Amino acid sequence: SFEKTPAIKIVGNKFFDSESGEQFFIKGIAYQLQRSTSYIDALADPKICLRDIPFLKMLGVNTLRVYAIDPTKSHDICMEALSAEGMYVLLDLSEPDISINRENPSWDVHIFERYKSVIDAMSSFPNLLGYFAGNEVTNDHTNTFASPFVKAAIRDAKEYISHSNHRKIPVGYSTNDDAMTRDNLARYFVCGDVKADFYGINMYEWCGYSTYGTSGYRERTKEFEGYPIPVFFSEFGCNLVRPRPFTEVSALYGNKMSSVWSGGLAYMYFEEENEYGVVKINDNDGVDILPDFKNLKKEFAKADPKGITEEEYLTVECPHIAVGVWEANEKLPETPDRSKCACLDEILPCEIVPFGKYEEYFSYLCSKVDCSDILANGKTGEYGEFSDCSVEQKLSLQLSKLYCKIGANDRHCPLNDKNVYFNLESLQC
Numbered sequence: 001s002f003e004k005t006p007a008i009k010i011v012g013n014k015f016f017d018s019e020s021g022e023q024f025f026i027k028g029i030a031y032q033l034q035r036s037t038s039y040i041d042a043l044a045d046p047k048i049c050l051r052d053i054p055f056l057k058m059l060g061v062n063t064l065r066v067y068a069i070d071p072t073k074s075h076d077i078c079m080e081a082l083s084a085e086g087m088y089v090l091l092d093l094s095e096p097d098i099s100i101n102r103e104n105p106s107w108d109v110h111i112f113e114r115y116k117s118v119i120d121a122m123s124s125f126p127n128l129l130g131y132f133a134g135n136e137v138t139n140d141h142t143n144t145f146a147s148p149f150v151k152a153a154i155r156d157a158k159e160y161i162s163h164s165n166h167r168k169i170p171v172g173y174s175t176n177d178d179a180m181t182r183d184n185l186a187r188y189f190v191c192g193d194v195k196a197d198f199y200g201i202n203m204y205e206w207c208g209y210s211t212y213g214t215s216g217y218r219e220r221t222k223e224f225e226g227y228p229i230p231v232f233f234s235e236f237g238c239n240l241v242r243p244r245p246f247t248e249v250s251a252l253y254g255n256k257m258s259s260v261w262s263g264g265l266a267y268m269y270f271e272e273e274n275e276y277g278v279v280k281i282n283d284n285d286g287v288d289i290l291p292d293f294k295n296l297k298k299e300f301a302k303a304d305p306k307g308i309t310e311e312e313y314l315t316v317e318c319p320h321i322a323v324g325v326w327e328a329n330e331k332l333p334e335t336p337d338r339s340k341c342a343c344l345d346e347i348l349p350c351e352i353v354p355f356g357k358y359e360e361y362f363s364y365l366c367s368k369v370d371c372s373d374i375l376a377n378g379k380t381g382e383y384g385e386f387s388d389c390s391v392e393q394k395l396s397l398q399l400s401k402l403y404c405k406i407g408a409n410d411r412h413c414p415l416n417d418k419n420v421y422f423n424l425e426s427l428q429c
């Protein structure tokens with residue numbers, strides 16, 4: 001049963017409860033456990049989530065941000081338990097080992113399959129608020145060319161959801177707060193023919209007992225006034241001054257900011273040797289409440305954002321390219337084609353299995369054959385025909401091209417490595 005969490009929908013630049021029609025404001029906290037899979041999925045483990053939900057209820061949150069789930073595991077126990085307390089989930093589609101790499105960006109079948117798997121695992125829950133298609137991918141002026149790959153991911157996640165039987169859960173983006181790139185990033189993700197459905201900023205400008213004017217919150221609010229999609233703080237809670245008073249919460253849900261922002265999520269629930277937690281899990285797996293907890297609790301309790309209803313509410317150019325400043329082309333890479341890339345597994349004479357060596361093997365093979373067909377350039381908007389295939393498929397293509405160039409036809413692939421093998425399926429889309 002999900003009566004207490006009706007699905008939230010987007011109209012214009014605001015969230016709305018689909019039943020009542022009241023504006024939905026996010027009063028949230030990040031909820032994600034680490035190790036000392038690589039990620040831990042707290043929503044796949046009832047003993048973890050059912051321990052914490054009572055404490056989350058005390059905080060008075062209506063939303064969690066979760067950065068990683070294991071899509072092979074069940075989540076209905078934790079998601080229904082969250083729904084029981086009126087709590088929604090914002091969920092990143094990526095994870096640390098399967099993300100768009102800001103140092104070498106690609107939008108490919110491997111990353112897209114990860115996104116699909118999370119979508120298929122989590123879309124049945126009415127309290128799934130939205131998906132993030134990326135988190136701080138571009139983070140400064142040196143990697144703005146990663147952003148077209150994220151926009152392609154937004155488009156393709158939205159289309160995948162559209163073509164599924166699922167509820168059309170919105171797909172957005174979470175960005176950092178770098179001064180040189182923030183205005184261009186915000187414009188880029190709503191420009192042209194592809195748009196993020198919502199926009200989260202990881203916002204740490206307000207530290208200690210600051211103010212609306214002095215923190216920078218006033219300038220941010222004036223910048224995002226009239227922004228065409230919902231905007232919120234996907235993270236907040238600068239910890240320079242402790243215990244964190246969380247006085248930004250009073251500003252965030254006040255009348256000046258509540259007209260522009262759709263709330264935000266504190267970072268975070270768990271303490272992980274970083275002084276960002278509101279609780280600490282002890283050696284007996286029990287929850288010890290930390291000094292920040294009471295301050296966030298009081299601030300959320302006092303917050304009462306005056307929104308507008310759905311019915312009364314009902315009544316862009318991409319940034320130009322400039323070298324060293326903004327290098328994200330409007331032209332996006334194509335939708336990764338699993339069938340095309342899977343046909344390389346069939347027909348290619350020389351293949352390499354996944355298991356440092358990528359840099360060496362690409363450097364070696366791309367000096368002997370033309371690797372243009374696997375390159376992807378977000379600056380120039382030039383995307384090779386097989387640039388959407390997996391790193392292994394890309395490598396295999398180049399090895400196979402070298403094999404055909406030599407033309408011995410003796411089943412000896414021209415790269416001595418144990419991961420290399422001659423594909424017997426090639427001899428038989």
Ligand SMILES: OC[C@H]1O[C@@H](O[C@@H]2[C@@H](O)[C@H](O[C@@H]3[C@@H](O)[C@H](n4cc(CCC[n+]5ccccc5)nn4)O[C@H](CO)[C@H]3O)O[C@H](CO)[C@H]2O)[C@H](O)[C@@H](O)[C@@H]1O
Nearest residue numbers: 032067068092094095096097099100101102135136137204
């Ligand atoms: O796509 C961009 C990059 O994504 C990386 O993975 C991603 C990963 O780094 C990210 O990690 C977040 C991490 O960004 C977030 N976090 C918050 C903070 C506090 C920052 C404090 N602070 C204070 C003041 C100013 C600025 C900052 N520190 N870390 O904490 C989350 C839960 O603890 C954690 O999961 O989570 C994503 C989703 O799962 C992965 O997609 C990949 O590993 C990189 O290869 C890739 O380049």
